[PDB]
Scaffold this active site. Structure first.
Site, PDB file in Angstrom:
ATOM      1  N   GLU A   1      26.224-138.205  24.067  1.00 22.24           N
ATOM      2  CA  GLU A   1      25.281-138.175  22.924  1.00 22.24           C
ATOM      3  C   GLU A   1      24.082-139.446  23.129  1.00 22.24           C
ATOM      4  OE1 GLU A   1      26.534-138.294  18.949  1.00 22.24           O
ATOM      5  OE2 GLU A   1      27.729-136.273  19.314  1.00 22.24           O
TER       6      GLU A   1
ATOM      7  N   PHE B   1      18.082-138.606  21.995  1.00 27.41           N
ATOM      8  CA  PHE B   1      17.428-137.022  22.507  1.00 27.41           C
ATOM      9  C   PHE B   1      18.411-136.080  21.984  1.00 27.41           C
ATOM     10  CE2 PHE B   1      20.330-138.332  26.042  1.00 27.41           C
ATOM     11  CZ  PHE B   1      21.212-137.254  25.644  1.00 27.41           C
ATOM     12  N   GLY B   2      19.863-136.280  21.839  1.00 35.55           N
ATOM     13  CA  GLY B   2      20.621-135.197  21.253  1.00 35.55           C
ATOM     14  C   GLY B   2      21.888-135.271  22.100  1.00 35.55           C
TER      15      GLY B   2
ATOM     16  N   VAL C   1      24.676-133.973  25.285  1.00 36.01           N
ATOM     17  CA  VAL C   1      25.128-133.520  26.728  1.00 36.01           C
ATOM     18  C   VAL C   1      26.305-132.614  26.495  1.00 36.01           C
ATOM     19  CG1 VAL C   1      25.197-133.490  29.333  1.00 36.01           C
ATOM     20  CG2 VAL C   1      23.607-134.933  27.881  1.00 36.01           C
TER      21      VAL C   1
ATOM     22  N   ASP D   1      13.595-146.212  31.409  1.00 37.89           N
ATOM     23  CA  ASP D   1      14.479-146.328  30.679  1.00 37.89           C
ATOM     24  C   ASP D   1      16.080-146.468  31.376  1.00 37.89           C
ATOM     25  OD1 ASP D   1      15.994-146.519  28.255  1.00 37.89           O
ATOM     26  OD2 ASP D   1      16.163-144.201  28.013  1.00 37.89           O
TER      27      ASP D   1
HETATM   28  C1  LIG Z   1      21.922-138.213  29.634  1.00 41.62           C
HETATM   29  C2  LIG Z   1      20.888-137.207  30.308  1.00 41.62           C
HETATM   30  O1  LIG Z   1      19.731-137.253  30.086  1.00 41.62           O
HETATM   31  C3  LIG Z   1      21.482-136.439  31.245  1.00 41.62           C
HETATM   32  C4  LIG Z   1      20.529-135.515  31.994  1.00 41.62           C
HETATM   33  C5  LIG Z   1      20.842-134.618  32.915  1.00 41.62           C
HETATM   34  C6  LIG Z   1      22.467-134.536  33.268  1.00 41.62           C
HETATM   35  C7  LIG Z   1      23.305-135.234  32.688  1.00 41.62           C
HETATM   36  C8  LIG Z   1      24.643-135.196  32.761  1.00 41.62           C
HETATM   37  C9  LIG Z   1      24.907-133.991  34.099  1.00 41.62           C
HETATM   38  N1  LIG Z   1      26.505-134.440  34.234  1.00 41.62           N
HETATM   39  C10 LIG Z   1      26.734-135.098  33.194  1.00 41.62           C
HETATM   40  C11 LIG Z   1      27.977-135.716  32.939  1.00 41.62           C
HETATM   41  C12 LIG Z   1      28.203-136.600  32.042  1.00 41.62           C
HETATM   42  C13 LIG Z   1      27.059-136.969  31.474  1.00 41.62           C
HETATM   43  N2  LIG Z   1      27.173-138.205  30.461  1.00 41.62           N
HETATM   44  C14 LIG Z   1      26.180-138.861  29.791  1.00 41.62           C
HETATM   45  C15 LIG Z   1      25.492-140.119  29.872  1.00 41.62           C
HETATM   46  C16 LIG Z   1      24.980-140.743  28.659  1.00 41.62           C
HETATM   47  C17 LIG Z   1      26.495-141.188  29.164  1.00 41.62           C
HETATM   48  N3  LIG Z   1      26.001-136.508  31.461  1.00 41.62           N
HETATM   49  N4  LIG Z   1      25.807-135.690  32.456  1.00 41.62           N
HETATM   50  C18 LIG Z   1      22.848-136.370  31.649  1.00 41.62           C
END
Ligand SMILES: CC(=O)c1cccc(-c2cnc3ccc(NCC4CC4)nn23)c1
Length: 338
Positions: free
Chosen positions: A24, A27-28, A30, A143
């Site tokens: 979270e 933005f929202g 995942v 960021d």
């Molecule tokens: C947080 C964000 O913008 C983002 C954007 C594209 C892909 C992902 C993504 C792809 N696989 C995963 C597995 C875990 C994950 N965790 C979120 C992050 C914020 C702590 N995010 N995630 C996150």
């Protein structure tokens, strides 16, 4: 609103079955999905809040990903691959390749215990290589923070430890990718006034002197010292306190930046407007010491890392090391032996 549409068992765009929440942000959300139309492949779906600001950030993110993914189809420079995007009950959802844990979640859940030096070196190199490719392509991330650096793989082991009543996680391979292009800005586009999360904001951002690729370099510096210690050296919320902490840790601010800033509230004549002899002042003092005193060892590879960290946290963005040059720093020579 968002709560009503991201539940386990929900099916998005008649193919994506939510199996778990990954994280979270502002933005929202995942979520982890089984893609029933790609042989049951697990993917990641960013569900954006149905709010103007986050919607426009998500259209901006999609445009950046199309560009980065097209320019670098093998993900050699380690930006996350976007698979597609759709709308689900008014929310933009971006599908991505599933990665493993955020560096943030890995440190937090191990009790704020640092990454090993050997791991940090490999991770710093990949982070610099990935952000340098945005730098080549007329972008600033803006960021960068541990939440936005994810392990490619679940290449770790985990055991319950009853002594301390949590799981401990041991990294095997430290390979990362960079995520979240919701804030990424092209050189010719309008620059936001405030950018970055407080702990990783460059002094040029705090003082509204204008920003560029160098503000990313500052954020990477802050990430590296957090990886090495297990916590930030700037544990504050307030802008002035943050500037007090920079003085204690890095030394005085350049007078030219102090005098040029319209952010005059923070100052009084030539100097930070900060009662050091007060309760909040003595607190910052206790929490802060010159950067190189954070070193846990005097071994030369610790000297190497802290020299790069110190060049990444140069106050003057016109002087700050570039990622092109950071990639060439002595800290990385260990990776290029042959
Ligand atoms: C947080 C964000 O913008 C983002 C954007 C594209 C892909 C992902 C993504 C792809 N696989 C995963 C597995 C875990 C994950 N965790 C979120 C992050 C914020 C702590 N995010 N995630 C996150």
């Amino acid at each position: 609103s968002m709560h009503l549409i991201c539940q386990s068992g929900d099916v998005l765009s008649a193919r994506y079955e939510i199996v778990d929440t990954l994280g979270e942000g502002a933005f929202g959300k995942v979520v982890e999905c089984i893609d029933h139309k790609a042989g049951g492949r697990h993917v990641a779906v960013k569900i954006v809040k149905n709010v103007d600001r986050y919607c426009e950030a998500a259209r901006s993110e999609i445009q950046v990903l199309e560009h980065l993914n097209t320019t670098d189809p093998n993900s050699t420079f380690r930006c996350v691959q976007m698979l597609e995007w759709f709308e689900h009950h008014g929310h933009i959802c971006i599908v991505f390749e599933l990665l493993g844990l955020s560096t943030y979640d890995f440190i937090k859940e191990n009790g704020f215990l640092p990454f090993r030096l050997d791991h940090i070196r490999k991770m710093a190199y990949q982070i610099c290589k990935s952000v340098n490719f945005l730098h080549s392509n007329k972008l600033t991330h803006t960021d960068l923070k541990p939440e936005n650096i994810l392990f490619v793989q679940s290449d770790y082991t985990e055991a319950y430890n009853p002594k301390i009543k949590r799981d401990e996680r041991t990294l095997i391979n430290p390979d990362i990718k960079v995520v979240d292009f919701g804030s990424a800005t092209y050189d010719d586009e309008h620059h936001s006034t405030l950018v970055s999360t407080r702990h990783y904001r460059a002094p040029e951002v705090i003082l509204a002197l204008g920003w560029s690729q160098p503000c990313d370099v500052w954020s990477i510096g802050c990430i590296l010292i957090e990886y090495y210690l297990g916590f930030t050296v700037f544990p504050t919320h307030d802008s002035k306190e943050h500037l007090a902490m920079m003085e204690r840790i890095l030394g005085p601010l350049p007078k030219h930046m102090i005098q040029k800033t319209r952010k005059r509230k923070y100052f009084h004549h030539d100097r930070l407007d900060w009662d050091e002899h007060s309760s909040a002042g003595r607190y910052v003092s206790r929490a802060c010491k010159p950067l190189k005193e954070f070193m846990l060892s005097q071994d030369v590879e610790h000297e190497r890392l802290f020299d790069l960290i110190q060049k990444m946290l140069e106050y003057d963005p016109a002087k700050r090391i570039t990622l092109r040059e950071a990639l060439k720093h002595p800290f990385f020579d260990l990776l290029k032996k042959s």
